[PDB]
Amino acid sequence: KKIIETQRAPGAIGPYVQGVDLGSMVFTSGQIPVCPQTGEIPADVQDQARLSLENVKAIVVAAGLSVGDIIKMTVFITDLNDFATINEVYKQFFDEHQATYPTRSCVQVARLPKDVKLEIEAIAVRS
Amino acid sequence: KKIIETQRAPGAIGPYVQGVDLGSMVFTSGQIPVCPQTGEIPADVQDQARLSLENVKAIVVAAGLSVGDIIKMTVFITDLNDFATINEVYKQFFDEHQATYPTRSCVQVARLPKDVKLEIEAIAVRS
Amino acid sequence: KKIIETQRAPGAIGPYVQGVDLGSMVFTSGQIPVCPQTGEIPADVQDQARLSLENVKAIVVAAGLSVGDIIKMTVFITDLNDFATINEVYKQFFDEHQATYPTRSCVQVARLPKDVKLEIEAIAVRS
Numbered sequence: 001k002k003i004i005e006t007q008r009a010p011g012a013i014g015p016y017v018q019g020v021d022l023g024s025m026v027f028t029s030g031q032i033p034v035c036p037q038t039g040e041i042p043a044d045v046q047d048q049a050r051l052s053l054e055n056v057k058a059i060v061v062a063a064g065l066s067v068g069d070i071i072k073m074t075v076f077i078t079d080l081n082d083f084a085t086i087n088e089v090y091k092q093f094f095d096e097h098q099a100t101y102p103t104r105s106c107v108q109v110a111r112l113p114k115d116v117k118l119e120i121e122a123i124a125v126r127s
Numbered sequence: 128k129k130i131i132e133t134q135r136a137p138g139a140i141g142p143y144v145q146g147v148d149l150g151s152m153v154f155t156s157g158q159i160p161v162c163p164q165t166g167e168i169p170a171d172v173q174d175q176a177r178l179s180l181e182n183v184k185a186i187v188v189a190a191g192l193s194v195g196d197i198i199k200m201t202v203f204i205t206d207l208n209d210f211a212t213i214n215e216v217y218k219q220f221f222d223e224h225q226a227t228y229p230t231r232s233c234v235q236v237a238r239l240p241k242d243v244k245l246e247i248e249a250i251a252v253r254s
Numbered sequence: 255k256k257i258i259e260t261q262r263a264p265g266a267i268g269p270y271v272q273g274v275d276l277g278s279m280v281f282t283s284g285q286i287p288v289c290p291q292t293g294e295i296p297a298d299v300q301d302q303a304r305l306s307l308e309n310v311k312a313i314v315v316a317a318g319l320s321v322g323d324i325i326k327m328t329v330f331i332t333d334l335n336d337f338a339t340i341n342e343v344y345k346q347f348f349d350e351h352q353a354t355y356p357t358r359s360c361v362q363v364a365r366l367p368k369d370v371k372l373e374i375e376a377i378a379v380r381s
């Protein structure tokens with residue numbers, strides 16, 4: 001097992017790491033829509049959805065994998081009224097990478113770190 | 128990295144697949160109590176709990192595994208008043224398949240897709 | 255698979271086992287701050303955070319692993335205003351065991367079993 005560290009996702013500040021590479025599989029921490037260059041959160045849910053996905057991608061790529069290697073995500077959201085919009089961004093993200101859609105669970109939680117609108121964790125496999 | 132597709136669980140609404148088979152282990156998407164034939168959601172939570180579990184089972188069996196190969200579930204619910212009823216159905220389901228109980232997490236979320244009362248994801252292993 | 259059972263973590267109430275050992279990987283059930291000897295839930299969030307973590311430790315140890323083998327934690331909580339206290343206890347727990355921090359997701363849910371303030375599920379790997 002090996003820690004994943006990348007400047008292309010928000011840095012871990014505290015008692016977790018961005019990702020862990022087990023060889024056969026990679027786990028990410030839950031990624032929130034904080035911009036790694038600014039430490040700020042875009043207000044618009046479309047922009048948050050894209051940025052959470054970009055943060056996940058940065059970690060998977062730092063491990064030497066690709067978006068197409070992601071096989072499970074969990075998408076925690078604060079408002080299911082945002083779901084159709086989040087889904088559209090998510091679908092286009094995978095389509096743009098010519099990637100098969102992963103398995104997914106999606107639930108509306110009460111609140112997320114920094115009052116973001118979503119948090120996404122991923123599991124990828126090394127094929 | 129084989130996709131699992133079965134008509135005995137609801138077809139994928141959004142950008143996800145029902146299950147993925149990695150060879151050593153199978154992940155399902157979070158299953159909601161939607162009838163795969165009719166698209167209907169049963170009104171009583173006893174019926175929703177059974178249907179969510181049948182939907183999980185369909186995907187696991189589609190991968191060539193059994194209920195007894197399920198090693199972890201997460202049960203997301205909207206009302207802890209439903210918990211005893213859900214636990215009863217869940218226990219009977221595993222017992223009917225002569226299956227040891229998996230590990231489990233259970234939490235009450237704010238809301239679920241299609242306003243269902245529960246969503247269940249699973250991980251199964253192939254020995 | 256092998257079931258993990260220890261009297262050092264609370265006994266299963268519902269239809270679940272404490273842990274499952276797959277050889278390369280161990281999964282725990284979501285651990286809540288119930289005292290394994292008395293059944294009591296401590297009132298204070300610092301004490302709940304410590305107890306949940308000890309319950310995770312008991313199961314990972316029963317599998318022949320240790321805290322430093324944990325690679326992912328999901329921390330479901332009822333109030334993000336508790337997070338600073340929870341995080342300090344969590345950091346101290348890993349630091350006391352000279353353990354690299356795992357990946358993590360943290361979200362605020364509506365409610366948890368037995369009205370606890372947090373529930374922590376772990377995944378560990380056998381190196």
